[PDB]
Design a protein around this nucleic acid. Structure first.
Lengths: 180, 134, 136, 289, 174, 130, 37
RNA sequence: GUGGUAAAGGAUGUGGCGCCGCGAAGACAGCCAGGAGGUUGGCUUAGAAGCAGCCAUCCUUUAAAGAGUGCGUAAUAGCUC
RNA sequence: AUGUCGGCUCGUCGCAUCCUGGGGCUGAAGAAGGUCCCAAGGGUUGGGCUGUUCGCCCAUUAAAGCGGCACGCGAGCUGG
């Protein structure tokens, strides 16, 4: 949830001058419903860190207009961190770009005894879920032991009805620290 | 003199050479060898830390009728806790149900301040620290 | 050390700007002032990390050595053409992000990074999963 | 320790005072009896200095020796041990040492500071009974090794307890305990080896000492021989003597890194060729004793 | 906050002067130099020091001012003084007249005169405390006489202030 | 959070369930030394909260909520906040009266109370041990 | 005990101090008297 | 006296920044006094009856609860918060 | 035409001090130390060997410094 003061400009000196003002340039775009819109940083940046945000739907309010959207991109700087350019994707009827955080809440078996580490792999996924998006998919496992890594098949999908991914694919892993 | 100081020891034994040593004559105690009396008195009651404050006094105080055992290990004694003798006490020796542990507080709550209402899981729940069963 | 089966043995020398970005376990370092970085510096690095994380904590490596390095003689007058090798630098232009989780909790990641990246030529900054990224 | 001349009027009896004679150790300088060091730290120094600037000549000052009653399989136990009779462990087990239990009368709290010192050779308590009469003084009994109590026990014990109470051994009941062996492998031909006992692994603090003797002016042109402390396992210490060499590349002061390269092989290849003929013969000259 | 309210009861004769405020008590006229931009005024017993502005300088100096003048009034109020405590048998001390005996350099003409408003109370060589007036020259003196043999990082032996328990290091052994 | 939320809330919660609250200056003894009297009514009966040890400002404005209409016979300075109300006060009070009076040098001077309905007198509380 | 750089605080009770362009770290324990200047 | 010549480095330098600290049911440093009773063993009980030494994650007072950080040692003992 | 090693004779200079001073810390009791800091005013010998600077080696001593200065100094020497 935030807003997003609109700006006419396209490409030139302006985005740079605005960054000098602290103000992300950005995009409002959806199935060729287009506009170029220019966010201010700071609070919209806390918003940006709010985790569900850049994932779960976020609303924004160009002048007084309201739109829902979920970020499709953030161009980073390379010379340093800090985002350079946000890209929105407003949601009409069906969204499919679904970038879902996982919450595996593993039952103990490996990290504690064998010392093996449950390395996160894909962290977050690409599924399909029109305006009813499930939050934290929760796939507990006691297979922490043995050095197995349960794949993408095992998620057992909650009503966000689709695996876009090719099924079964090391979604979450354990790696031995020194093999047991 | 006035060696009536406070010096706890281990319940139920005989020769107190590892605990006494400088905790008796050193300060100004007297005699020795109420070893037998330590047996004759405390070899019986409370395997839950039953030491008698060696009240330093002329002729060297005697044993029998200590004060009390205290500690959680009296307030919940029915167990032992040998565990950890090697390692940091993994598991085991931790259950005769919650329940025999509670019924053991019906008489395992001897002398203490004025007197609080409970000596079970309102203090055995401090043995929650003391033992292995938090 | 590593770099086996190079197909040449005399690369030139360029460097100026580029990079990568994300953490891959989520406490990684990231260089600022850009430089060569030879393998020796890496053995020193991952060792400082290892020995600080209970000699087995999980360190994804990161960058990797490639371009050959050489002085050529001993002090012999230059003239002959360019040969030999002993350095084997990777190049790290700014923003390259070394990848170093260890599930090792909070500060130890930080501190092991302090040592480790301080066992290296270039000033560096400590970061983790944050401004994020996604595509397909 | 005499350096040399034996007997020479074994001035032992002299006049009262815990005299001593005979019973001398060998190892690498016999020196006959090694006594003459009873009472305090004075009687020893005094007597040693007496015959020194009075009658005796340039004498030694070695430390004390041991025995080690090993137990070689198929019977052994004793077998008369000598600072050289090291028959490895082929004698089955060890079990050799004099674990004497003395009775220290440390009062006040000299125990705390002393109890730690008594650990000179892994000691233990036997009967800790609070002395009677009143207080102040105290008692103490351990099972240290007569080998780790002989030298350096009083001068150090008196300082830990301000120099109170006393101490007396019992020399009763043997014992095994770790011993080990330590031999200084000079150059690479191995000589004397000196060694010690390695009992409980002590050569360490002694290995990097006896070996790293800096080499008694043993350079030999440019032998560069490395003096390592060969006790009983690969290598413990590592004392290498410096060679000599010659300012060979000191006349071609010019150019070309090739010229200064030739006058380097003759010195490098030669130094090695020598590492064959002679080794090292530096025993006398006041051993690192 | 706590940077302005000074109580000066008693019967003081404090008065301001161009950056050189003054105090007149029972026997002192103890001076109180200050920086003019802070500036102070006093009435009855209330004492009204003031802060020109809040760059760190003026505030910090402000605190000086309140402290220094406070030390003036408390100082002349009695004739302020510092406790002292020689210990460890290597000593003697005596008032002598207008310098101290002392005895600890063993070749010990360790003479030492009072400078000014100072005078030496010689009560027991195990005490010997010194009168003065202004606290800071009291300190200059306590430092001077304490300047000769105070530490003994092994066994106690020397001059001491009121007295630490006195940190030690273990002696030759034990 | 900062305000009435951490204990403060329940502070006058259960205490309000009664109608004869009390207060004392008890504290100034070593933890064990008055631990010995840290169970008076708790021995005389059960479930006492004697020596609750909140005080002024912490409860001095929170006393108005309590509707004792003025327990301010002890609110200033040290204040044990020991409720005579938790017990049905009578014979039990002596077990807390001897406990704070007989003990030590200045074992535990009382502030006052709200014993019964009307506030207990500063002397009468001292006067009526039972 | 000049260490003229570093100066990392270790007695942990340790005080840090600038003074006359220096950075002494004074501690109640004598060992820690580091001084980058 | 930086300016009027140098880096990794360290730095409650100093000015200003955007978050983070109010608990007037009143924090902060100083304090004043109390820092807990069963809260005391697993092994070492040579001591762990915390802060020798290889786990102790819940109740008592609730001021809060130190499963207990710190001196220290035979532990303890008496000592910060 | 910029006479090149070494020695003599004369030097002066700096400090990254060998001694002499002044001080921290210690696994410093004292003494002897260790080790870093401030310290350039003075002092840093006599020999054997070799062309030798260098180096070991005798005798010591407070010590027996490291360097500059066209590897200081030949319109001043010697020339091994």
């Amino acid at each position: 949830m935030e807003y997003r003061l609109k700006a006419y400009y396209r490409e030139g000196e302006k985005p740079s001058a605005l960054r000098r003002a602290g103000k992300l340039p950005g995009v409002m775009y959806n199935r060729h419903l287009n506009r170029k819109v220019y966010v201010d940083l700071v609070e919209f940046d806390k918003v940006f860190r709010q985790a569900s945000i850049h994932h779960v739907i976020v609303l924004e309010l160009p002048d007084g207009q309201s739109l829902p959207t979920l970020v499709r991109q953030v161009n980073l700087d390379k010379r340093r961190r800090r985002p350079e350019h946000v890209d929105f994707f407003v949601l009409s009827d069906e969204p499919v770009e679904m970038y879902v955080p996982l919450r595996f809440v593993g039952t103990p078996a490996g990290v504690r005894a064998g010392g093996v580490l449950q390395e996160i792999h894909r962290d977050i996924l690409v599924k399909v879920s029109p305006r009813n998006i499930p939050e934290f998919i929760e796939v507990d496992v006691s297979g922490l032991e043995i050095g197995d890594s349960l794949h993408a098949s095992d998620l057992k999908l909650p009503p966000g009805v689709e695996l876009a991914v090719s099924p079964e694919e090391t979604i979450a892993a354990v790696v031995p620290p020194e093999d047991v | 003199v006035v060696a009536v100081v406070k010096l706890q020891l281990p319940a139920g034994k005989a020769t107190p050479a590892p605990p006494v040593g400088p905790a008796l004559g050193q300060h100004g105690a007297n005699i020795m060898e109420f070893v037998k009396a330590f047996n004759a008195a405390t070899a019986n009651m409370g395997d839950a830390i039953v030491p008698v404050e060696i009240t330093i006094y002329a002729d060297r105080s005697f044993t029998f009728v200590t004060k009390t055992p205290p500690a959680s290990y009296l307030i919940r004694k029915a167990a032992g806790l040998e565990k950890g003798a090697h390692k940091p006490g993994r598991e085991k020796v931790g259950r005769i149900t919650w329940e025999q542990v509670l019924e053991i507080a019906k008489q395992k709550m001897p002398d203490l301040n004025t007197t609080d209402l409970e000596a079970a899981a309102r203090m055995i729940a401090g043995s929650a620290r003391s033992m292995g069963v938090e | 050390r590593m770099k086996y089966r190079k197909q040449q043995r005399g690369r030139l020398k360029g460097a100026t700007k580029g990079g990568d970005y994300v953490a891959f376990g989520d406490y990684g370092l990231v260089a600022l002032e850009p430089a060569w970085i030879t393998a020796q510096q890496i053995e020193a690095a991952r060792v400082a990390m290892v020995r600080h994380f209970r000699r087995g904590g999980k360190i994804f490596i990161r960058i990797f050595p490639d371009k050959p390095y050489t002085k050529k003689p001993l002090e012999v007058r230059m003239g002959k053409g360019k040969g030999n090798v002993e350095g084997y630098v990777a190049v790290v232009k700014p923003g390259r992000v070394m990848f170093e989780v260890a599930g090792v909790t909070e500060e130890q990641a930080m501190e092991a990074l302090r040592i480790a990246g301080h066992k290296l030529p270039i000033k560096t900054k400590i970061v983790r999963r944050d401004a994020y990224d996604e595509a397909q | 320790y005499p350096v040399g001349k034996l007997r020479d009027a074994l001035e032992k009896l002299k006049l009262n005072d815990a005299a001593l004679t005979f019973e001398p150790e060998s190892s690498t300088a016999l020196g006959f009896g090694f006594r003459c060091g009873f009472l305090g730290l004075l009687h020893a120094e005094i007597v040693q200095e007496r015959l020194e600037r009075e009658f005796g000549l340039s004498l030694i000052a070695t430390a004390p020796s041991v025995v080690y009653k090993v137990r070689l399989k198929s019977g052994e136990e004793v077998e008369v041990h000598n600072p050289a009779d090291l028959p490895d462990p082929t004698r089955i087990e060890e079990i050799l040492e004099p674990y004497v239990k003395l009775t220290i009368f440390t009062p006040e709290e000299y125990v705390g500071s002393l109890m730690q010192l008594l650990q000179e050779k892994r000691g233990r308590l036997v009967n800790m009974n609070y002395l009677p009469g009143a207080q102040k003084r105290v008692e103490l009994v351990y099972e240290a090794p007569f080998a780790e109590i002989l030298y350096d026990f009083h001068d150090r014990l008196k300082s830990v307890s301000r120099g109170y109470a006393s101490m007396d051994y019992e020399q009763a009941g043997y014992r095994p305990g770790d011993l080990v062996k330590v031999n200084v492998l000079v150059h690479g031909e191995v000589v004397d080896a000196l060694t010690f006992i390695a009992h409980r692994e002590k050569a360490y603090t002694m290995a990097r000492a006896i070996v790293d003797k800096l080499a008694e002016v043993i350079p030999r042109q440019l032998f560069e021989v490395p003096i390592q402390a060969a006790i009983g396992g690969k290598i413990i210490a590592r004392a290498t003597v410096k060679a000599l060499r010659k300012d060979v590349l000191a006349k071609c002061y010019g150019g070309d890194v090739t010229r200064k390269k030739k006058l380097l092989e003759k010195q490098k290849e030669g130094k090695k060729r020598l590492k064959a003929i002679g080794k090292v013969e530096v025993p006398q000259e006041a051993f690192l004793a | 906050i706590g940077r302005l309210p000074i109580p000066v009861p008693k019967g003081v004769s404090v008065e301001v002067a161009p950056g050189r405020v003054k105090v007149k008590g029972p026997k002192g006229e103890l001076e109180v130099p200050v920086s003019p931009e802070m500036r102070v005024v006093v009435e009855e017993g209330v004492v009204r020091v003031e802060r020109p502005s809040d760059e760190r300088r003026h505030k910090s100096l402000h605190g000086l001012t309140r402290t220094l003048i406070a030390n003036a009034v408390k100082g002349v109020s009695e004739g302020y003084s510092k406790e002292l405590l020689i210990k460890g048998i290597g000593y003697r001390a005596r008032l002598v007249g207008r310098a101290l005996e002392l005895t600890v350099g063993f070749s010990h003409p360790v003479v030492v005169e009072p400078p000014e408003g100072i005078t030496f109370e010689v009560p027991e060589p195990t005490r010997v405390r010194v009168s003065g007036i202004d606290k800071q020259k009291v300190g200059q003196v306590a430092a001077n006489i304490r300047a000769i043999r105070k530490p003994s990082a092994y066994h106690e032996k020397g001059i001491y202030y009121a007295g630490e328990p006195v940190r030690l290091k273990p002696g030759k052994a034990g | 959070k900062r305000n009435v939320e951490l204990l403060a809330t329940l502070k006058e919660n259960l205490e309000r369930a009664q109608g004869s609250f009390f207060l004392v200056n008890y504290q100034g003894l070593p933890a064990k030394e008055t631990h010995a009297l840290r169970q008076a009514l708790k021995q005389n009966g059960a479930r006492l909260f004697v020596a609750k040890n909140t005080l002024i400002r912490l409860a001095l404005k929170e006393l108005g909520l309590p509707e004792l209409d003025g327990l301010q016979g002890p609110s200033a300075v040290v204040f044990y906040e020991d409720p005579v109300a938790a017990a049905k006060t009578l014979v039990q009070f002596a077990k807390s009266n001897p406990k704070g009076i007989p003990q030590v040098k200045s074992g535990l001077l009382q502030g006052q109370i709200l014993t019964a309905k009307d506030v207990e007198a500063l002397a009468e509380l001292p006067t009526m041990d039972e | 005990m000049k260490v003229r750089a570093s100066v990392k605080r270790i007695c942990d009770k340790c005080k840090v101090i600038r003074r006359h362009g220096r950075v002494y770290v004074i501690c109640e324990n004598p060992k820690h008297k580091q001084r980058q200047g």
